[PDB]
Design a protein around this ligand. Structure first.
Ligand SMILES: [Mg+2]
Lengths: 90, 49, 49, 159
RNA sequence: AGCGAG
């Protein structure tokens, strides 16, 4: 019994306190789904599935695939040394 | 140790696109890589490759 | 990395329901190669003056 | 029991054409290892004949199983536990068992529910996999081919 | 990272 509760708590915390720009949970689940589906269609089709394949496998309009992957663009850090002396900030 | 997995016979397919075209359309000049796997269930005794 | 993910999933793999294709995840290997050929310091921008 | 050129059913890959058999002496024992090839994954499976039935390999089922699965497709009054997790586990174990009747019942129940009101992606994946294996098995059950097997599945589900 | 001047 406690395994499912612990899994749920950890997954919810990952959904909430993991991204600098908080995407609410339901969005988080749909994006995680998109990622998994494109991973499996990557295992099968080999080339990264084009938006059409994901839209079909996810029962949403392809533009919705676009926005689901647009909301999930993780920020970057303006304190990265772009060299490999200058941080991206300046 | 009930089952094991193994790899063998790496083999490359023909490159995806010619050199100039790859340099033109910004796609990497790469070739597919195929490796024959082999899964053996040590107890039951099945090989799947 | 692929080896580690294979071993980790193998515990949660239903026996006789698994084949190497559905047991192997190539994503770590391709990710490592791609992150090497780009942003690795020994993979330098070709100097053609 | 095992003859060359026979379209034998191997779980959970469905149809699996035999090619031959090899001595493959291991531990000094020429343990017979018959070779199967499945058109779905294009993989070769070598199994020992002595315990081949133990794994679950079965020959092409006759028309008795065909009419059985049709009648079962016309078996009403099915109820499932309230929780989604329990019923999902039950039907997943039913599929894993490899019994043609159990997977057929799972496929029909899930399809009627999905067509009833539409469910989700995981159930869709389960339904797709189970329907694929069933259509292949039926196609070889009457050698009716995958396309015509899909169509006969589509007419018989109508009831 | 390669590179220039001292
Ligand atoms: Mg000077």
């Amino acid at each position: 019994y406690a395994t499912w509760w612990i899994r749920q708590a950890i997954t919810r915390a990952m959904a909430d306190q993991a991204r600098t720009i908080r995407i609410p949970v339901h969005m988080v689940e749909v994006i995680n789904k998109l990622g998994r589906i494109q991973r499996e269609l990557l295992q099968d089709l080999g080339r990264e599935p084009t938006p059409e394949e994901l839209a079909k496998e996810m029962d949403i309009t392809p533009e919705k695939v676009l926005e689901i992957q647009q909301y999930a663009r993780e920020p970057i850090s303006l304190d990265q040394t772009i060299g490999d002396d200058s941080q991206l900030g300046d | 140790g009930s089952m094991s997995l193994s790899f063998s016979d790496p083999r490359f397919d023909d490159v995806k696109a010619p050199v100039d075209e790859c340099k033109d359309k910004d796609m990497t000049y790469a070739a597919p890589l195929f490796v024959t796997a082999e899964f053996i269930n040590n107890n039951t005794g099945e090989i799947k490759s | 990395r692929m080896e580690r993910v294979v071993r980790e999933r193998m515990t949660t793999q239903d026996v006789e329901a698994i084949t190497p294709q559905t047991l192997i995840n190539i994503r770590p290997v391709v990710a490592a190669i791609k992150e090497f050929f780009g942003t690795s310091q020994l993979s330098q921008f070709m100097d053609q003056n | 029991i095992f003859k060359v050129g026979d379209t034998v059913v191997y779980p959970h890959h469905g149809a699996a054409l035999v090619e031959a058999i090899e001595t493959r002496t291991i531990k000094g024992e020429q343990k017979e290892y018959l070779v199967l090839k499945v058109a779905q994954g294009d993989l070769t499976v070598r199994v020992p004949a002595e315990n081949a039935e133990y794994v679950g390999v079965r020959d092409v089922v006759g028309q008795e199983g065909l009419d059985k699965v049709f009648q079962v497709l016309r078996a009403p009054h099915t109820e499932e536990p309230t929780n989604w997790s329990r019923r999902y586990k039950a039907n997943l174990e039913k599929l894993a068992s490899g019994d043609v009747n159990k997977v057929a019942e799972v496929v029909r129940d899930l399809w009627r529910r999905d067509q009833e009101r539409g469910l989700s992606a995981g159930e869709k994946r389960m339904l797709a996999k189970a329907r694929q294996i069933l259509v292949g098995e039926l196609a070889l059950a009457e050698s009716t081919d995958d396309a015509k097997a899909e169509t006969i599945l589509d007419e018989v589900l109508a009831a």
